């Protein structure tokens, strides 16, 4: 909408009190003009109509139950641009300053959250399984690293090409995470999972068999469920992504880490000019390898941990 740009404050799922960026007109709106050609979160009202209504509130105040996921929803909307604007120098998902656009309150007990396309989209969670799944940051990330995706390699969403697709949201997830600071780690979704249980998550990258996935190519998942495996054989890549940026030794084969950042800088690189809609696993070791060679040199101690990282996990 057209109005002027405010500042409001709220809590989130978690219960923290967070400042966030709004626009007056009548209504303060969930409408954040400070990022690109805005910020903008919509409310599904426990509905699957999309995108819902534009969030509308009296006073600028949102610490109501019922505000906590758009809260977190509009907030981490703003926290993961600003780290693909300041560490990629990339303007929203498409390089153009897109707007981003999120709805909550999405259906009924929804134990999900996706990119359908066109917007973000967040569950409630069912209270067991889930709790609003906005309010796990990497889950935002995530899912607006859907976008990039598309915008960039285009990987379909099957097989390797899907499970790589599903990887690059996972380590853009997590880098996020990382960059604001916040309890972070390299496990995806602990913020929002399984209220009643501590100290899980929906998947791991530093140990996927933690959680039954994959961590070495022999062990992938072959079948059709989950279009192929797609959040189960992203372990593989996830695995190669912390080795690469962490180091260790896996199976028997020892990478020197090379830190979050780097990782950020040879992934991204090899997300924007290398990978295309049907590359599979050893295609992305070749665009990371190349990618590390842009970046680096053929000689450099990154090249050669992004070769011992997919040795680890038996991808040649
Ligand atoms: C099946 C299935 C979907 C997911 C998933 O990653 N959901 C998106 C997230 F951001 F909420 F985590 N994991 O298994
Ligand atoms: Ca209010
Ligand atoms: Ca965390
Ligand atoms: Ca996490
Ligand atoms: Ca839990
Ligand atoms: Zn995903």
Redesign the pocket.
């Known amino acids: 909408i057209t109005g002027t740009s405010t500042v409001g404050v709220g809590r989130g799922v978690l219960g923290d009190q967070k400042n966030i960026n709004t626009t007056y007109s009548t209504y303060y709106y969930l409408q954040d003009n400070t990022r690109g050609n805005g910020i903008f979160t919509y409310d599904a009202k426990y509905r699957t109509t999309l995108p819902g209504s534009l969030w509308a509130d009296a006073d600028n105040q949102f610490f109501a139950s019922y505000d906590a996921p758009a809260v977190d929803a509009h907030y981490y909307a703003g926290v993961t641009y600003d780290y693909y604007k300041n560490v990629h120098n990339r303007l929203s998902y498409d390089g153009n300053n897109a707007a981003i656009r999120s709805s909550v309150h999405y259906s009924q007990g929804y134990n999900?959250?996706?990119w359908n396309g066109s917007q973000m989209v967040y569950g409630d969670g069912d209270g067991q399984t889930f709790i609003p799944?906005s309010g796990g940051i990497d889950?935002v990330a995530?899912?607006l690293t859907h976008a990039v995706t598309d915008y960039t390699a285009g990987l379909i969403y099957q097989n390797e090409s899907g499970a790589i697709n599903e990887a690059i949201s996972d380590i853009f997830g997590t880098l996020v995470e990382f960059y604001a600071n916040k309890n972070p780690d390299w496990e995806?979704?602990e913020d929002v999972y399984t209220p009643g249980i501590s100290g899980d998550s929906?998947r791991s990258m530093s140990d996927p068999a933690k959680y039954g996935d994959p961590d070495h190519y022999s062990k992938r998942y072959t079948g059709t469920q989950?279009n192929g495996g797609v959040?189960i054989n992203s372990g593989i890549i996830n695995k190669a992504a912390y080795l690469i940026s962490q180091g260790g030794t896996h199976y028997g084969v020892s990478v020197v880490g090379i830190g979050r950042d780097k990782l950020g800088k040879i992934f991204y690189r090899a997300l924007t000019q290398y990978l295309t809609p049907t590359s599979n696993f050893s295609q992305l070791r070749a665009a990371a390898v190349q990618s590390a060679t842009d970046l680096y040199g053929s000689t450099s101690q990154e090249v050669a941990s992004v070769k011992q990282a997919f040795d680890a996990v038996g991808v040649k």
């Open positions: 999900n959250a996706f799944l889950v995530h899912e995806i979704g929906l989950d959040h």
